[PDB]
Amino acid sequence: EHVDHKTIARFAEDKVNLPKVKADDFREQAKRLQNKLEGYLSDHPDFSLKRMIPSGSLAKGTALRSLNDIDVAVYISGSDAPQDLRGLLDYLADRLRKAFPNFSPDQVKPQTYSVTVSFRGSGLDVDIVPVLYSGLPDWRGHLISQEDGSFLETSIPLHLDFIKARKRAAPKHFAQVVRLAKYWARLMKQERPNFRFKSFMIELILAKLLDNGVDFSNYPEALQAFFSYLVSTELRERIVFEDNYPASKIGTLSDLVQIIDPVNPVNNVARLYTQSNVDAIIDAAMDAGDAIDAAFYAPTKQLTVTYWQKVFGSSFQG
Numbered sequence: 001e002h003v004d005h006k007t008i009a010r011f012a013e014d015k016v017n018l019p020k021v022k023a024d025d026f027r028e029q030a031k032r033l034q035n036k037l038e039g040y041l042s043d044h045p046d047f048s049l050k051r052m053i054p055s056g057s058l059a060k061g062t063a064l065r066s067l068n069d070i071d072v073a074v075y076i077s078g079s080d081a082p083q084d085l086r087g088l089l090d091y092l093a094d095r096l097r098k099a100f101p102n103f104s105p106d107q108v109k110p111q112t113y114s115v116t117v118s119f120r121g122s123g124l125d126v127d128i129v130p131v132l133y134s135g136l137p138d139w140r141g142h143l144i145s146q147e148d149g150s151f152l153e154t155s156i157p158l159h160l161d162f163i164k165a166r167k168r169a170a171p172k173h174f175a176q177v178v179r180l181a182k183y184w185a186r187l188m189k190q191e192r193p194n195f196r197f198k199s200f201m202i203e204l205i206l207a208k209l210l211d212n213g214v215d216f217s218n219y220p221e222a223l224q225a226f227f228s229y230l231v232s233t234e235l236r237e238r239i240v241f242e243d244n245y246p247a248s249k250i251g252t253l254s255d256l257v258q259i260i261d262p263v264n265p266v267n268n269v270a271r272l273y274t275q276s277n278v279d280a281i282i283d284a285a286m287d288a289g290d291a292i293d294a295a296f297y298a299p300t301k302q303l304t305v306t307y308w309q310k311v312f313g314s315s316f317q318g
């Protein structure tokens with residue numbers, strides 16, 4: 001009544017989602033870099049940068065209006081490349097300057113776990129993560145973690161297939177609920193001590209709920225299922241998918257939270273989450289779920305909005 005699914009959908013369109021016109025501009029930005037590398041590699045077959053793949057929320061259709069960087073993975077092959085993290089990022093930056101000679105050298109900047117290509121206002125910065133590639137199936141290779149620089153063997157193409165499958169199972173709605181949950185998590189990171197919640201983990205948890213039959217066409221109910229899953233399981237239930245391997249193949253782990261990469265059964269996406277992190281997520285999810293329930297039963301629109309502002313902050317006006 002006061003706030004229902006349509007209210008939430010309109011809020012998402014108004015405040016949460018990256019507008020389609022901007023998403024298209026940014027994807028065309030990444031495609032121009034992709035095409036420049038493909039043309040350089042066509043002329044120089046020995047060049048060690050073999051492929052650029054858009055890998056982040058823009059590629060998945062889950063970007064927020066707050067997006068300020070475009071994610072691409074660059075696949076690196078050959079003996080020249082150092083295995084050390086610092087050396088590899090310096091090596092990648094040097095190769096990028098050679099393939100993109102029109103850029104001023106200072107427009108390519110190594111960071112802690114990635115290399116930035118800065119466009120200086122004429123487009124967003126592109127954040128390039130290396131993948132050491134040696135020809136494993138499905139363009140598997142060792143991706144650099146943006147949490148701790150660990151080398152993680154995985155497949156970005158298969159992750160994008162994984163997300164595509166859930167978006168086809170629930171068109172519009174899966175991506176929308178992911179975006180709403182990401183928007184909530186951004187607010188909680190500012191408000192709750194020790195709160196951390198990686199976007200890929202939010203997507204995997206929501207993909208499990210969709211797989212399990214949760215109806216994503218009602219956004220208040222889908223969010224309540226997400227928050228209630230976190231409170232009831234306390235993030236102690238292992239999340240694993242059978243898209244690419246059977247449950248017999250999952251390696252046992254001693255990690256507190258286990259949300260297993262759908263490509264690689266020994267790669268736990270949640271490996272760095274501590275009990276402190278978990279407790280902050282659980283308290284935040286309990287509070288959000290409680291706010292949505294109270295909002296449903298609130299007698300006035302003003303009270304209903306106040307409760308939803310506990311979930312989505314002051315930008316939510318009803």
Ligand SMILES: Nc1ncnc2c1ncn2[C@@H]1O[C@H](COP(=O)(O)OP(=O)(O)OP(=O)(O)O)[C@@H](O)[C@H]1O
Pocket residue numbers: 055056057058060062063064071143152154155156159198199200201261267268269270
């Ligand atoms: N722990 C991991 N193991 C394997 N691959 C990962 C891991 N974390 C991230 N990735 C890969 O990096 C991609 C980007 O995930 P990330 O959590 O950075 O979110 P995003 O979709 O870019 O959202 P945003 O940057 O808006 O928070 C994932 O889709 C996946 O391919």
Ligand SMILES: [Cl-]
Pocket residue numbers: 055056057058059069070071
């Ligand atoms: Cl992105």
Ligand SMILES: [Mg+2]
Pocket residue numbers: 056057071
């Ligand atoms: Mg990203």
